[PDB]
Amino acid sequence: SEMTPREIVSELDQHIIGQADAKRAVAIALRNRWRRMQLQEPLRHEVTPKNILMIGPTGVGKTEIARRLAKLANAPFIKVEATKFTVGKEVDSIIRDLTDSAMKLVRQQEIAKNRLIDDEAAKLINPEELKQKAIDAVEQNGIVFIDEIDKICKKGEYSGADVSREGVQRDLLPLVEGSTVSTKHGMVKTDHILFIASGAFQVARPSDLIPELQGRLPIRVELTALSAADFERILTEPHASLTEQYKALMATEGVNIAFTTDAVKKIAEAAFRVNEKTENIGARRLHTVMERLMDKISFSASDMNGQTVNIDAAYVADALGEVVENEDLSRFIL
Amino acid sequence: SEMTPREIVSELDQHIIGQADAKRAVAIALRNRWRRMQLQEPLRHEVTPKNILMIGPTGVGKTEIARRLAKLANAPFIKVEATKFTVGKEVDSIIRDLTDSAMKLVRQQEIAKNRLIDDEAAKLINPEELKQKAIDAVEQNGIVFIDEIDKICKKGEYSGADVSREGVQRDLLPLVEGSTVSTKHGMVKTDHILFIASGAFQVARPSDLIPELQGRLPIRVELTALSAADFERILTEPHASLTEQYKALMATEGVNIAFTTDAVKKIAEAAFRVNEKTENIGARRLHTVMERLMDKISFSASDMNGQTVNIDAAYVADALGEVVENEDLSRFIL
Amino acid sequence: SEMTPREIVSELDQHIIGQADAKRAVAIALRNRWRRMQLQEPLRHEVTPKNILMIGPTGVGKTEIARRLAKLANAPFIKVEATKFTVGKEVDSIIRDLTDSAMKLVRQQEIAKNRLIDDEAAKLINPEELKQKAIDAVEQNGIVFIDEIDKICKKGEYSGADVSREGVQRDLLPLVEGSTVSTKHGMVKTDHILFIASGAFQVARPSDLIPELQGRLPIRVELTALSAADFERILTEPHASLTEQYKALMATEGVNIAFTTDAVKKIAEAAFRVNEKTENIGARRLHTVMERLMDKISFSASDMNGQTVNIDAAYVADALGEVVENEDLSRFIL
Amino acid sequence: SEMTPREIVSELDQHIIGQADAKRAVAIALRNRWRRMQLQEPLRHEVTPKNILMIGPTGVGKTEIARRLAKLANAPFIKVEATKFTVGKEVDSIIRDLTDSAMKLVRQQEIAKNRLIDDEAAKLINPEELKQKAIDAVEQNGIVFIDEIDKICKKGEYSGADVSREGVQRDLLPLVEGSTVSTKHGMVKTDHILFIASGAFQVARPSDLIPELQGRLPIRVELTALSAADFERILTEPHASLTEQYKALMATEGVNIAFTTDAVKKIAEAAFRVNEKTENIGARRLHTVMERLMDKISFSASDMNGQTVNIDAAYVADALGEVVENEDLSRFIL
Amino acid sequence: SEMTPREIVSELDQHIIGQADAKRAVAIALRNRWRRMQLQEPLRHEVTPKNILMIGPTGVGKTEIARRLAKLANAPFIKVEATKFTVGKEVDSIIRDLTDSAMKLVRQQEIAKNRLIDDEAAKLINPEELKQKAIDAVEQNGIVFIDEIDKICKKGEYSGADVSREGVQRDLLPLVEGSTVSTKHGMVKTDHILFIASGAFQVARPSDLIPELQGRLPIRVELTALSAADFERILTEPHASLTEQYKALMATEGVNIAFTTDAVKKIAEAAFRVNEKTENIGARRLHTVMERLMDKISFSASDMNGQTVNIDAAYVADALGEVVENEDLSRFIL
Amino acid sequence: SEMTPREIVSELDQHIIGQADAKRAVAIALRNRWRRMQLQEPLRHEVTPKNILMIGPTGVGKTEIARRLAKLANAPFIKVEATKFTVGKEVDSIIRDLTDSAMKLVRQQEIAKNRLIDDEAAKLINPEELKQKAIDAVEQNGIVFIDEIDKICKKGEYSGADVSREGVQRDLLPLVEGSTVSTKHGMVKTDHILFIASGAFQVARPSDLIPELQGRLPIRVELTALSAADFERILTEPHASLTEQYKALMATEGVNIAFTTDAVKKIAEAAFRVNEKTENIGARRLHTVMERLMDKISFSASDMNGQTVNIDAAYVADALGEVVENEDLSRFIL
Ligand SMILES: Nc1ncnc2c1ncn2[C@@H]1O[C@H](COP(=O)(O)OP(=O)(O)O)[C@@H](O)[C@H]1O
């Protein structure tokens, strides 16, 4: 898009708390596409996407940053899990699924951008028109998110699976290097598709990836663990935060809810407490804690039409009970 | 549907004895769909289904609650066994089978809702009409029941199958996270499909599921073991209970049967006795015990037209004989 | 059909010697279909087939009872071996093959039930007419015989194959529980298909089957070993018995044969003697013994037109020679 | 055919030396088809083919007897190796290949039996005409030869392959028991297809085959080893014997050859000598010995037009040299 | 093409630094095609391509020389990883993918070489016209690059994979020897396709390849390791070098950058330093170092419109910081 | 063809040096086809091809003799590697690929044998015309070369692969025995296809092949190792020898080269020296040595237009340097 790096980050800031480095890395990556378009031949086709490799713990915004990025750029997105390819599925599926994603994007945008009348829905839908467009979207703005790419790295005492793993990287090369893949909508060039690979790299390191693949993931960026304070912001700041979602849902029932300031600190404190006591699943822990919290009101909201319900610290401690501190309970409920 | 949580539970109560927590959890889940529909963009598409994970022993109503739920909501249902995916079958089959289920639902409802005349059965059946409808049903009201999801959790001394198991969870992610799957009726978005996963979690715990999947199963609910008293109610209270079924079947033969109060306690006592002496298969034990009980009358009902047969405690003890107390017999017969 | 349990058993008696319990179990099962049809909604669709599990030694009439049952009911039958499913074949094949079987049944019955003229064979054969009929036959009267279902039960020191075995039961569930399967003739509901599972259960017990599958095989019935006296009756009583078959075959050659009373006792005595001395293969042993007996006359019948040949005890002892008592010979010849 | 057992054996005698028992067994089997056709319903469809199991060493005429049998009966034949089925191929292929074989038989017989003119080759070739005919041939006269069926028998220390082997027998059951298989020419009933199974049964015995399969191979017959005297007859008596073939081939070159009486004894003596000194491959040994013998004359026959060449004992000893007695040479050359 | 060896090398020199031997080997190979075309039958079809085997370390120009070669010759190129073939993929895919590559080359060249007007894009696009052309391109000028062919060589303690590896070479033979492969565009002869195989041959040697394959890789050539001085030239001399690319990208932002002489020595010194301290990935190391260097300016270039930025030694040392010397950092960042 | 054995060998002599026995064996084999055609029914179809098994070291002319044979007979050829079949590929592929080969042969011969005019290329190309012809070529003159057939023989300590190997022979039987295979051009009878199997038989012997397959490879012939003197002749005598090829290639550049008598002895001496010092790859060694020799002149020929270059002993010793005697070098370069 015509958006500048800072404008892209400003947009990302409204959905993702923190992770400024990753926000900048993807902003740059998206801006480069615009820059390349301002170039002239023969340097235009020589310049390829600077794929990004995100390094960070689980549930801190890696995928979300990528999803959001694709959203604000109005581009075809696709998430895939690396280990998925170690019969089975062929990597080309990635580009295939991605072209489908591009179809919806093109369809809903075409038919909508041109308005009993159902029998006259065509008059714009040219079988070749849409196919070339979907292809065009994928070839020029396609974004592929490759999760757990650190799990296809040679682990310890190599050989056995470390032969199958590297085979996955190997099979990914044609895609990140620039290949032509066949899809039900025609051929697709992967040359300018932006690739975002992710991994925790707890044991494995990026230098463990086969060399041909390291060179195709030039941009290395780290995402940080989230703090209780971060959970606090996430709960209320991002567009469509959990508190805003629940507030809107109860409203359809005639119930007006409100979270006091400390009730939010309490919720975030609960999530962070379970992650550090058991397994840290990051921001995701916020989902179960909120559901546990909104359990009761969610079920009986229909019987409280016209009421305002204040969810304060007391309400939160009541709803959570002994769950947070008792692993026997938390490992089931949260 | 327009049904409120309490109305949904009231309906569930007429088919399932007990399990109030699970009945509430699914009621909420179904009501949320209605609520989301009352929202406005851009918060409407941001709100996703709060998938449910049922935790409980075998044969206590987990699936039945899900089946019934789909029934009362007039929605496409599909049951699948997790371990089924560890060539083989691809998870997308789930969404494929589910779209077929949606086809029948749409067909039988369309042709019926619009009435020699066989050659004029069309005049409503538009190849595109039904396909978009079936797709619409699945995308907006689809319900998937994933049984034994605790068997695809990393067991002990991980690795070997614990690599294949988690691969299943991994492959399930795109579905529970929101993917587009191709089906003979067109593309299908799984974004708003309600997922109900089930497991006994005797050894494994929900916290053992990969994190990306925990976050997509926010609602955790427990189902309880059933008591002899519960078996008692099940035998006669639910719509189409076993006693009501047998009574109606014998009636077609001209035989009027009746179960005395204690005969029912005796039947339920027998089932509960075998489950606690051998393997507890819950309510299912009621099927074999009833068949053993109705064996004789079922075969000769044709020769008793016009008779009323009272099945009392004595009749039950006679029909069961030594089966209940002799494992050598019970493990074959019941 | 409109046939009563006793009428069904009377018919079965003319093909199968003994096994009264199994004859009654299948009679009941077939009668239930008629009964369910006399019911009214919504109890009509709630009542499902009471599948049968036959427990008994090999070659005593399990399959034959099922084959015959399908015959007298004019219904689509299909036999399948359980272990067959442990790439490979998918259980849906069962329903697919079963629908084909239903096609022949419908075709031969339609074209025949409506009578140079070859070019006018149509005028009734409507591509949609037959397909809906075949589907209808399978959905309403389909019968599936699942042999060796005890071989897919967890054996000893479980795990290894006991994981693959139970997977088979698991994959069978959708069929016995009620699923929709796609076939070249359209979709097929397995909801009202009657399932008859068989097994010797020498080591494994029915209680070893996964619980979901036990509940779907409510009727447990035992078949007994056959005696020399039973072999005696089988040789001459059932319609199309072996003696009647051979008598009719030789007659086409102009040869009239007759078995004296003791010649039959001798034949049955021979079969029973080999089964108890080596491996008991039940009634099947009667096939080889009869062939050994009719060997000579069968070859030269063409040269004996106009003759009556009396097969007496002496003839039988001559034809059999030392085979019965010498395992070295019997294990090759019989 | 209308041929009697003795007429069938007389025909077989002109192609196969010895093996009177096997010749009689297949004659009977083929005659039974005719007999069954003389029967009336409902005994007609009840009578099934008496499949044959041939027991004997390699290269003594088992397959040849079956090939010839199919020839003289003008029926679709197909040879298959059992172990072939232990992805891979599905047994149904057998019936598929067999239907193709039936196509050629029907085509060449139809177009031929009805006579620039190439553009008028049709006027008889009705796409449905031939397909129903080919189907008819296979269903009524099809013959399947199953070689090495003793290799799919449970060997020693069962389990491992003895599980896969018996699976083959299991998968063969539907075919020998009577199934319907789909083929590019339509559905095919295997009910009346005659099956001839073969095996050396050196270690395994027929009683080792699963019981369901023993019963479907009622006729057991043994083929004997061949003697030097048998090799002697084979070399010159059967239609298209090796000597007759070579005599006709050299004649096209203008060379008249003749084998003296003792030259033939010498050739047969050589073959029998190598089989008993190394590995006995039966009659097949006659192929290599004849080729070694005719090597020289075969190459230079073109330069001997007009000559009569007498192949006598001296010629044979010359051509064979030291090959027969030197295993180092015989294992390469013969 | 009509280009002479020296003209081809002169062209290669503008993209690849060093590697004169490999540049000559491919120049010769490409010139031979022209020479063969000047020959007359029957010597014309007897002369086959002198395939090349490149021996050298990773990231020194093996693939690039091949890519460039295909470019300057306007020929269909395809890169493939040998181990990729050890279900899976069939080598024929190589020729299939290669024919697709040839399609784009032909299309873009045809429609372009012949010029509202969109509905009149045809008038040249003959379905058969393009297919025969694409086929023609592949058959006459096709170039296949087979990477890591030394990994399919029998390693140590042969057998296990050394059986699968050599199978790959075996399956490659038909292609390098001259085969006909089927593709969606028709049949394709691989007879005159130039094959370039590559490998590091650190342990394995060319003499380890199966003999049939050695003979089809007649030209053996070595590529050398690159020096810091080479990295220096690569950074600025080749067309579309990294410095030229970055200069052009920033220019679209209104930023004029310039690298001082020593800044370039510093960049090349950094890359060479990391390769010799950790893992030598050759020229590829230049990608990560440049990205690390241009990180800051790349993100904020939009805010520096109108500025000239001099990237000198100081700027480079600043941007790199401690990364180069700290393996803990370099293995993540570079 | 009408060619006599001696005429066929005379033709083979102009392409293959030595191997008189193998040349005679294939000449005979090809002549037999002609002879069989001179026969009358019913002996005509009884006579089958005398398949050949070639026994000899690698690179001595086995394949070449077969290729050439197919050439001079204008017949469809196909080379296949036995171990290729141990999912994977099915032997029928052999007959399929062979029918394609037959298509080209028929096409290029038909369209050529019958002559702006491009739009009038048809008027002879009848879709059925060519298909029946290609089929006819394969059925009557098809030649299949089966390399490494000694690698599918039971090795040592049989079982493991010796079960898979023999399975290959087993699957080959239907082809060599006479089967019907389906191909995109119609059905194909393999009855008269000539099969040439090859192997080094260093450890395994022909007597190790399963008996059914020995009998179908009646003609056993040995090929000898080649001497330095043989290499000498090969370099210059065969049509399209290496020296003749290089002479013609340089001529297109304006360069006239000539090899002195001793220069040729020197080249052949070099090849033979490397084969006996390292691994003997036979005549193939001549390819690398010639390329090493012609390296320099081949690259600069363009700059020597008008020159005569005499390649004498001195030139050869110069070009080869230390390669021949230094295994470290020879195993890379030659
Ligand atoms: N609470 C209950 N109320 C009514 N019926 C029940 C209940 N629990 C079990 N059943 C009966 O027992 C069977 C149990 O299967 P299901 O409900 O799927 O549970 P589970 O998944 O634990 O086996 C069903 O056929 C149902 O009719």
> What is the 3-state secondary structure of F229-249?
HHHHHHHHCCCCCHHHHHHHH
Long-range contacts of B311-315 (CB under 8 A, 24+ apart): B311/B257, B311/B258, B311/B259, B311/B260, B311/B263, B312/B260, B312/B262, B312/B263, B313/B260, B313/B262, B313/B263, B313/B266, B315/B263
Burial class (CB in 10 A: 0-12, 13-18, 19+), A121: exposed
Collect all residues with Cβ–Cβ distance below 8 Å to A308 and sequence separation of at least 6.
Answer: A255, A256, A257, A258
Q: Which of E334, E275, E270 is nearest to A206 (CA)?
A: E334
Work out whether strand E219-222 and strand E52-55 pair parallel, antiparallel, or are unpaired: parallel
Which atom of ligand 1 is the closest one to the Cα of B15?
4
The DSSP output letter for B91 is T
* Alpha-carbon separation of residue F146 from F54, F138, F195, F280 (angstroms): 10, 16, 7, 22
A50 is in an annotated binding site: no
Read off the amino acid at residue E304.
M
- CB–CB of B46/B268 below 8 Å? no
Q: Are residues D195 and D302 in the same domain?
A: no
Sign, Cα dihedral of D85, D87, D92, D93? negative
Nearest to F245 among E5, E47, E201 (CB): E47
- Alpha-carbon distance of E34 to E1, in angstroms, equals 6
- Alpha-carbon distance of C194 to C178, in angstroms, equals 11
- Alpha-carbon distance of C275 to C264, in angstroms, equals 17
- CB–CB of B306/B254 below 8 Å? yes
Does any CB of chain C come closer than 8 Å to the CB of residue D155? no
Q: Which of F334, A209, A170, A213 is nearest to E151 (CA)?
A: A170
Work out whether strand C180-183 and strand C186-189 pair parallel, antiparallel, or are unpaired: antiparallel
> Whole domain around residue A198: which residue ranges?
1-104+135-223
Would you call A173 helix, strand, or coil by DSSP? helix
DSSP string of C209-245, one letter each residue: S-HHHHTT--EEEE-PPPPHHHHHHHHHSSTT-HHHH
| Chains touching E (3+ CB pairs < 8 Å) | A, F
- CB–CB of E77/E139 below 8 Å? no
Read off the amino acid at residue B142.
G
Read off φ and ψ for residue D146, nearest 5 degrees: -105, 100
- Alpha-carbon distance of F231 to F268, in angstroms, equals 5
Q: Which two tokens stand for residue C92?
A: 């849906």
Q: For residue C136, what is the enclosing H or E element?
A: helix C127-141
């690849």: which residue's tokens? Answer: E16
Nearest to F173 among D81, D303, D334 (CB): D81
Query: Considering only CB atoms, which chain A residues are within 8 Å of E245?
Result: 43, 46-47
Q: Are residues E210 and E166 in the same domain?
A: yes
- Alpha-carbon distance of A215 to E63, in angstroms, equals 14
Q: C64: number of CA atoms within 13 Å, CB side?
A: 23
Count the Cβ atoms, other than its own, within 10 Å of residue D314: 13
The DSSP output letter for C182 is E
DSSP H helical ranges for chain B: 5-13, 20-38, 62-72, 92-112, 127-141, 162-177, 211-214, 228-236, 242-251, 261-277, 285-300, 313-320, 327-333
- CB–CB of D282/D57 below 8 Å? yes
Q: Which of C295, C320, C332, C306 is nearest to D27 (CA)?
A: C295
Asked if F205 and D332 come within 8 Å (Cβ–Cβ), the reply is: yes
Asked if A248 and B173 come within 8 Å (Cβ–Cβ), the reply is: no
D53: left (phi over 0), alpha (psi -120 to 50) or beta: beta
Does any CB of chain B come closer than 8 Å to the CB of residue A156? no
Query: Considering only CB atoms, which chain D residues are within 8 Å of F168?
Result: none
> B65 C-alpha vs ligand 1 centroid, how far in Å?
8
Work out whether strand B52-55 and strand F143-147 pair parallel, antiparallel, or are unpaired: unpaired
Does any CB of chain A come closer than 8 Å to the CB of residue E84? yes
Q: Are residues A9 and A63 in the same domain?
A: yes
């349990």: which residue's tokens? Answer: C5
Work out whether strand F180-183 and strand D186-189 pair parallel, antiparallel, or are unpaired: unpaired
> What distance in Å separates residue C252's CA from the closest CA in chain D?
6
Query: Considering only CB atoms, which chain A residues are within 8 Å of E279?
Result: 207, 211
Does any CB of chain C come closer than 8 Å to the CB of residue D220? yes
Collect all residues with Cβ–Cβ distance below 8 Å to D60 and sequence separation of at least 6.
Answer: D18, D19, D223, D224, D225, D226, D282, D283
> What distance in Å separates residue F94's CA from the closest CA in chain D?
17
> E143 C-alpha vs ligand 1 centroid, how far in Å?
65
At residue D266's C-alpha, the angle toward residues D262 and D272, to 5°, is 140
Q: Are residues B153 and B259 in the same domain?
A: no
Does any CB of chain B come closer than 8 Å to the CB of residue A304? no
Q: Are residues F184 and F266 in the same domain?
A: no
Read off φ and ψ for residue F259, nearest 5 degrees: -105, 125
Q: Are residues F28 and F168 in the same domain?
A: yes
Number of H helices, E strands in chain E: 13, 9
Which atom of ligand 1 is the closest one to the Cα of B64?
17
- Alpha-carbon distance of C5 to B302, in angstroms, equals 8
F291 is in an annotated binding site: no
- Alpha-carbon distance of E171 to C152, in angstroms, equals 40
The 10 Å CB-count burial string (b at 16+, else e) for A134-171 is bbebbbebbbbbbbbbbbbbbeeeeeebbeebbbbbbb
Which atom of ligand 1 is the closest one to the Cα of B230?
1
Collect all residues with Cβ–Cβ distance below 8 Å to F7 and sequence separation of at least 6.
Answer: none
Long-range contacts of C63-66 (CB under 8 A, 24+ apart): C63/C145, C63/C147, C63/C198, C64/C15, C64/C16, C65/C12, C65/C16, C65/C19, C65/C22, C65/C23, C65/C26, C65/C223, C66/C26, C66/C143, C66/C145, C66/C196
The 10 Å CB-count burial string (b at 16+, else e) for D28-56 is bbbbbbebbeebeeebeeebbbbbbbbbb
CA dihedral E91, E96, E97, E98 (to 10 degrees): 100
Q: For residue F104, what is the enclosing H or E element?
A: helix F92-112
Q: Which residue of F has its CA nearest to E163?
A: F83
Q: Are residues E14 and E49 in the same domain?
A: yes
Read off the amino acid at residue A326.
N
- CB–CB of A152/A79 below 8 Å? no
Work out whether strand A77-81 and strand B143-147 pair parallel, antiparallel, or are unpaired: unpaired
Q: Which of B310, B292, B286 is nearest to B234 (CA)?
A: B286
Nearest to D215 among C83, C248, C281 (CB): C281
- Alpha-carbon distance of C255 to C303, in angstroms, equals 9
Read off the amino acid at residue C258.
A
- Alpha-carbon distance of D312 to D257, in angstroms, equals 10
Read off φ and ψ for residue C73, nearest 5 degrees: -100, -5
| Chains touching D (3+ CB pairs < 8 Å) | C, F
Query: Considering only CB atoms, which chain F residues are within 8 Å of D252?
Result: 34-35, 38-39
- CB–CB of B82/B149 below 8 Å? yes
Q: Are residues F314 and F179 in the same domain?
A: no
DSSP string of A2-38, one letter each residue: ---HHHHHHHHHTT--S-HHHHHHHHHHHHHHHHHHH
* Alpha-carbon separation of residue D192 from C292, D50, D177 (angstroms): 21, 10, 10
Does any CB of chain A come closer than 8 Å to the CB of residue E279? yes
Which atom of ligand 1 is the closest one to the Cα of B63?
18
Does any CB of chain A come closer than 8 Å to the CB of residue E299? yes
D61 is in an annotated binding site: yes
Read off the amino acid at residue C19.
Q
Q: Are residues F195 and F264 in the same domain?
A: no
Collect all residues with Cβ–Cβ distance below 8 Å to D194 and sequence separation of at least 6.
Answer: D29, D30, D33, D49, D51, D52, D141, D142, D143, D144
Query: Considering only CB atoms, which chain A residues are within 8 Å of B205?
Result: 331-332
């390791």: which residue's tokens? Answer: E225
- CATH for C198: 3.40.50.300
């949904």: which residue's tokens? Answer: B8
Collect all residues with Cβ–Cβ distance below 8 Å to A55 and sequence separation of at least 6.
Answer: A198, A199, A200, A201, A206, A220, A221, A222, A223, E332
Q: Are residues F265 and F178 in the same domain?
A: no
> What distance in Å separates residue A319's CA from the closest CA in chain E?
44
Nearest to D180 among C87, C101, C290 (CB): C101
Q: B300: number of CA atoms within 13 Å, CB side?
A: 6
- Alpha-carbon distance of C51 to D154, in angstroms, equals 33
Collect all residues with Cβ–Cβ distance below 8 Å to D232 and sequence separation of at least 6.
Answer: D264, D265, D268
Q: Which two tokens stand for residue B235?
A: 């035998």
> What distance in Å separates residue A37's CA from the closest CA in chain B?
31
Does any CB of chain F come closer than 8 Å to the CB of residue D43? no
- Alpha-carbon distance of A152 to A168, in angstroms, equals 7
Asked if E43 and F244 come within 8 Å (Cβ–Cβ), the reply is: yes
Query: Considering only CB atoms, which chain E residues are within 8 Å of F244?
Result: 43
């879709």: which residue's tokens? Answer: F127
Collect all residues with Cβ–Cβ distance below 8 Å to C117 and sequence separation of at least 6.
Answer: none
Distance linking the first and last C-alpha atoms of chain D:
40
DSSP string of C11-80, one letter each residue: HHHTT--S-HHHHHHHHHHHHHHHHHHHS-TTTTTT-----EEEE--TTSSHHHHHHHHHHHTT--EEEE
- Alpha-carbon distance of D210 to C63, in angstroms, equals 16
- CATH for C266: 1.10.8.60
* Alpha-carbon separation of residue D167 from C38, D172, F232 (angstroms): 43, 8, 59
Distance of alpha carbon F229 from the chain centroid: 22
- CB–CB of D84/F170 below 8 Å? yes
Work out whether strand A194-199 and strand A219-222 pair parallel, antiparallel, or are unpaired: unpaired
Read off φ and ψ for residue F56, nearest 5 degrees: 180, 165
Work out whether strand B219-222 and strand B52-55 pair parallel, antiparallel, or are unpaired: parallel
Q: Which of B136, B126, A130 is nearest to A122 (CA)?
A: A130
Strands (E), chain A: 52-55, 77-81, 143-147, 180-183, 186-189, 194-199, 219-222, 256-259, 308-311
- Alpha-carbon distance of E16 to D147, in angstroms, equals 64
* Alpha-carbon separation of residue A197 from A74, A95, B301, D267 (angstroms): 20, 15, 70, 76
Q: Which two tokens stand for residue E221?
A: 């050539």
- Alpha-carbon distance of B27 to B290, in angstroms, equals 31
Q: Are residues A180 and A299 in the same domain?
A: no
Named by the residue before each, gaps in chain F exceeding 2.5 A from C to N are: 86, 115
């950094």: which residue's tokens? Answer: E270
Q: Are residues C5 and C152 in the same domain?
A: yes
* Alpha-carbon separation of residue E166 from C321, D48, F93, F201 (angstroms): 60, 52, 21, 19
B198 is in an annotated binding site: yes
